[PDB]
Design a protein around this ligand. Structure first.
Ligand SMILES: *[C@@H]1O[C@H](CO)[C@@H](O)[C@H](O)[C@H]1NC(C)=O
Lengths: 229, 210
């Protein structure tokens, strides 16, 4: 069983450098070149280059020449990718790959049978930040005759992700938690909403549960109808 | 260099249907296809135009007519959805997102509008939120109006995955203003256009009303 094992995802600021590692098993490391390929969501995949574990010969794509360095450690069957002077355009999932045909005698590099699970790298000038949670209270402007709507606005946090639940998971029906959006500020914002019988507003109590592990912050905001005298 | 151009950009189908996607390449070569399941690593599906990789079912087949390659996936299964990329040598297509859309009868959005919270207002910013709940199909247009003035460049919008059970979508749009500008106006309106609506629908509120 041929396999490629990758190091985890990283968070960088612009200007910094990163090292990713790819470790092989199930075959003789020295026989095949190893490739690095980045996939930015919604953009064309970019082959960055290959490295030959035997010899350390290297070949980089023209756009990365001067800023990237590939190396291996034959003691551990590990290949390394280092990228310098990072910018937001370097945000992507970084994969290592290996060709399909590989024996002790020959190989062929370009049919990528074997991929690592990928290392997600985000380059942003933002620093990790716990969100602010705001009530999206129900009213007459959210009561459609018999069924109402309420929610929570989870604003200005970084990085992804946050988890949101209602009544500690008790409430799940009619709940829509939306995909976060990225703001000019470089910070994320998302909303979670749930529709319920306007009849219940009076009795039933609704609480949204927001957890943002990266900043180790956990908030429970109660969402109720605004009191009008 | 080799240029690879895939089409379409997006393909929306229901399981059981067959997906057909194309790659045009700028020179003769060995062309492969890769599938990326959401949040997963790409996997090799077909190489040299029409040869299936190990463990790939015959539902996948590739054909070629000169510079033009088609990848067809018959009898779509949940695990076949994702984005597909063609590749020659060092180069890749921009990808085709093959995603599930299940048909249902048209369902108009339910529109709710939410004013900024008092909590948020204590702090310089005001977010107005408009919810379009449980509609189909996915195509919907949201426009913000302040004192009847059409807004633009100051909203962001997000849509959920099609519901598993009722096959509806939901959309959330946020209009963000400084607290100061917010207090310069009275009427905040969300206007919604959708196939289920005989005509645009507006939800409005007036600043400072309970
Ligand atoms: C290749 O796929 C395209 C995309 O749908 C399709 O229109 C065209 O008919 C296919 N080519 C052939 C020869 O069937």
């Amino acid at each position: 069983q041929v396999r490629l094992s990758q190091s985890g995802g990283q968070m960088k600021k612009p200007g910094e450098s990163m090292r990713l590692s790819c470790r092989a098993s199930g075959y003789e490391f020295l026989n095949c070149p190893i490739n690095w390929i980045r996939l930015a969501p919604g953009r064309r995949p970019e082959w960055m280059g290959w490295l030959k574990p035997r010899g350390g010969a290297v070949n980089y794509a023209r756009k990365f020449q001067g800023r990237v360095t590939m190396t291996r450690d034959v003691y551990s069957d590990t290949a390394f990718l280092e990228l310098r002077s990072l910018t937001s355009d370097d945000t992507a999932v970084y994969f290592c790959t290996r060709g399909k045909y590989c024996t002790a005698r020959d190989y062929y590099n370009w049919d990528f049978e074997h991929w690592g699970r990928g290392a997600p790298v985000t380059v942003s000038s933002a620093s990790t930040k716990g969100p602010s949670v705001f009530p999206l209270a129900p009213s007459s402007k959210s009561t459609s005759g018999g069924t109402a709507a309420l929610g929570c606005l989870v604003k200005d946090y970084f990085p992804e992700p946050v988890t949101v639940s209602w009544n500690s998971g008790a409430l799940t029906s009619g709940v829509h938690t939306f995909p976060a959006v990225l703001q000019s500020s470089g910070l994320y914002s998302l909303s979670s909403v749930v529709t319920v019988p306007s009849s219940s507003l009076g009795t039933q109590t609704y609480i949204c549960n927001v957890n943002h592990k990266p900043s180790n912050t956990k908030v429970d905001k109660r969402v109720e109808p605004k009191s009008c005298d | 260099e080799i240029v690879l151009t895939q089409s379409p950009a997006t393909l929306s189908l229901s399981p059981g249907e067959t997906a057909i996607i194309s790659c045009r390449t700028s020179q003769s070569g060995s062309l492969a296809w890769y599938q990326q399941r959401p949040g997963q690593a790409p996997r090799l599906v077909i190489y040299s135009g029409s040869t299936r990789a190990a463990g790939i079912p015959d539902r996948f087949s590739g054909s070629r007519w000169g510079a033009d390659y088609n990848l067809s996936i018959s009898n779509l299964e949940s695990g076949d959805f994702g984005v597909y990329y063609c590749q020659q040598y060092e180069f890749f297509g921009q990808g085709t997102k093959v995603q599930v859309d299940i048909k249902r009868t048209v369902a108009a959005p339910s529109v709710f509008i939410f004013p900024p919270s008092d909590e948020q207002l204590k702090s310089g910013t005001a977010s107005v939120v408009c919810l379009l709940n449980n509609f189909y199909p996915r195509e919907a247009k949201v426009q913000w109006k302040v004192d009847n003035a059409l807004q633009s460049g100051n909203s962001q919008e997000s849509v959920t995955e099609q519901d598993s059970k009722d096959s509806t979508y939901s959309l959330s749009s946020t209009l963000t203003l400084s607290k100061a500008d917010y207090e310069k106006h009275k009427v905040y309106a969300c206007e919604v256009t959708h196939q289920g609506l005989s005509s645009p629908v507006t939800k409005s509120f007036n600043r400072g009303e309970c």
